[PDB]
Amino acid sequence: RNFSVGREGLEYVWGNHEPVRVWAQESAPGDPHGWPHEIIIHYYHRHPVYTVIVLCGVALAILVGIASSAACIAKARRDCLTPYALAPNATV
């Protein structure tokens, strides 16, 4: 029989014995001090939903940062060049 148990611990009663109590460590694959992927896998096995939401939030923030910075810089360069793109023989 398989029973799940977390940091709160679990009590099982078998036969007429005294109840047996057990508690779970945050033991999981990876290492919270290893390589970044070892970090991510360790926290995922510790808290899947929180790890997924963190990694997706970071990835999304990174993508937004890239897209917005590229749009900002390329638009600024475009309108900065615009007077020279218009004006022939101007300072290139």
């Binding site: 945050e26 033991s27 290492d31």
Partner: protein, 439 residues
């Protein structure tokens, strides 16, 4: 000196604090719930059990009419039949064969075994917790039992303590609970004077011997239809017995937080729920001015090979410089970690070996040897022991569950993401200024 601190409501767990009453030498304070007895407002409604049906010796009027009558007996039911001409082993028991009437009578009472097998319906409006606290302070040790409400002063002749109210509104018992042979079940039992035939609470009374028993059983009597005198009757099966056969698991095996449920009186025990606001008046005779205690000029933490686990997987040697030899209290001020020991004899110079437990992946906890404080820092490893038979001694918080060496990585990622748009905004503002100022 009066002191107050919150304490995790867990039995047997050693919770430790240091009363930093600076006018005196610091004193160790370890507080442990030795036991708890969550005792709700139990009130009896009625007893119940497998009702013993009684079909008393019927009444007949060989040549006359009979009438039914009301009776105090529970579910007391009667029917009358004519032309019944009942027999007995000696033969016919009446001289008339036409108007001969038979009064059949039936009612119920508790079976004799109900003295033991009786179930009882308990209403419980709310539980007034009562925790037994063991306290040690300095060289002294003490025990006391305090109702956890934050009002009553528990006393141990020396110490006085006030605990409560529990932050959590927890109760294991539902508003309705029923006891049986020391077992208990939360159940939607019907109120007194309410009876459902063939369901729990078929027969009810204020006591197992009360004369004012009340019951509903759908007892109904068929017409006597045979030579032998008889009172043919039928009824719903006992609702108590039916409930027993489909009672589900008892609360003894269903209350959360590891609550152990007991009878006489109904009480919850060892419930590990919430925290207890506790305040304590440690007698001033227990302290000394700092000058009389040994003290250290310098201290340093050499944490190594620490394992974050429910047990004392962390350990360190604490190096120190001190004024005199003697006993000195030791405590981990930061809640993220708790030391095993609380005081050790100290020399004028050396290092103290210590053990501790923490949930954070690193030893970034503040530790003090009887005054001076340092912060440890080394990274702690998880053990391969996924499960152990010992409860955790510290909570886990997302404020520090992420390792600093990884938290720095997350911060570097958000740094990159934010700095990208920061540079973008700066460049846009710069170009906006250029268009107007270097035109």
């Amino acid at each position: 000196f009066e002191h107050a601190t919150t304490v995790p409501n867990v039995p047997g767990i050693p919770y430790k604090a240091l009363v930093e009453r600076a006018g005196y030498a610091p004193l160790n304070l370890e507080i442990t719930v030795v036991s708890s007895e969550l005792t709700p407002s139990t009130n009896k409604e009625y007893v119940t059990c497998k009702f013993h049906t009684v079909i008393p010796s019927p009444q007949v009027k060989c040549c006359g009419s009979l009438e039914c009558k009301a009776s105090s007996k529970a579910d007391y039911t009667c029917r009358v039949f004519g032309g019944v001409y009942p027999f007995m082993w000696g033969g016919a028991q009446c001289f008339c064969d036409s108007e001969n009437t038979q009064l059949s009578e039936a009612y119920v009472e508790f079976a004799p075994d109900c003295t033991i097998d009786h179930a009882v319906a308990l209403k419980v409006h709310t539980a007034a917790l009562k925790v037994g606290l063991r306290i040690v302070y300095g060289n002294t040790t003490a025990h006391l039992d305090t109702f956890v409400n934050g009002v009553t002063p528990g006393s141990s002749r020396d110490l006085k303590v006030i605990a409560g109210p529990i932050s959590a509104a927890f109760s294991p018992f539902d508003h309705k609970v029923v006891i049986r042979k020391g077992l208990v079940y939360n159940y939607d039992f019907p109120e007194y004077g309410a009876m459902k035939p063939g369901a729990f609470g078929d027969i009810q009374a204020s006591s197992l011997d009360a004369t004012d028993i009340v019951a509903r059983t759908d007892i109904r009597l068929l017409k006597p239809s045979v030579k032998n005198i008889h009172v043919p009757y039928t009824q719903a099966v006992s609702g108590y017995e039916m409930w027993k056969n489909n009672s589900g698991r008892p609360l003894q095996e269903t209350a959360p937080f590891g609550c152990k449920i007991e009878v006489e009186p109904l009480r919850a025990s060892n419930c590990a729920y919430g925290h207890i606001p506790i305040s304590i008046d440690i007698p001033d005779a227990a302290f000394v001015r700092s000058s009389e205690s040994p003290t250290i000029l310098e201290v340093s933490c050499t944490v190594a090979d620490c394992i974050y686990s429910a047990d004392f997987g962390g350990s360190l040697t604490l190096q120190y410089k001190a004024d005199r030899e003697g006993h000195c209290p030791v405590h981990s001020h930061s809640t993220t970690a708790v030391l095993k020991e609380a005081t050790t004899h100290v020399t004028a110079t050396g290092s103290i070996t210590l053990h501790f437990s923490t949930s954070s992946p690193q030893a970034n906890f503040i530790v003090s040897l009887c005054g001076k404080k340092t912060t440890c820092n080394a990274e702690c490893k998880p053990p391969a022991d996924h499960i152990i038979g010992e409860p955790h001694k510290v909570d886990q918080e997302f404020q520090a569950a992420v390792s600093k060496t990884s938290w720095n990585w997350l911060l570097a990622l958000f740094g990159g993401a934010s700095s990208l748009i920061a540079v973008g905004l700066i460049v846009l503002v710069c170009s906006s200024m250029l268009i107007n100022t270097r035109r």
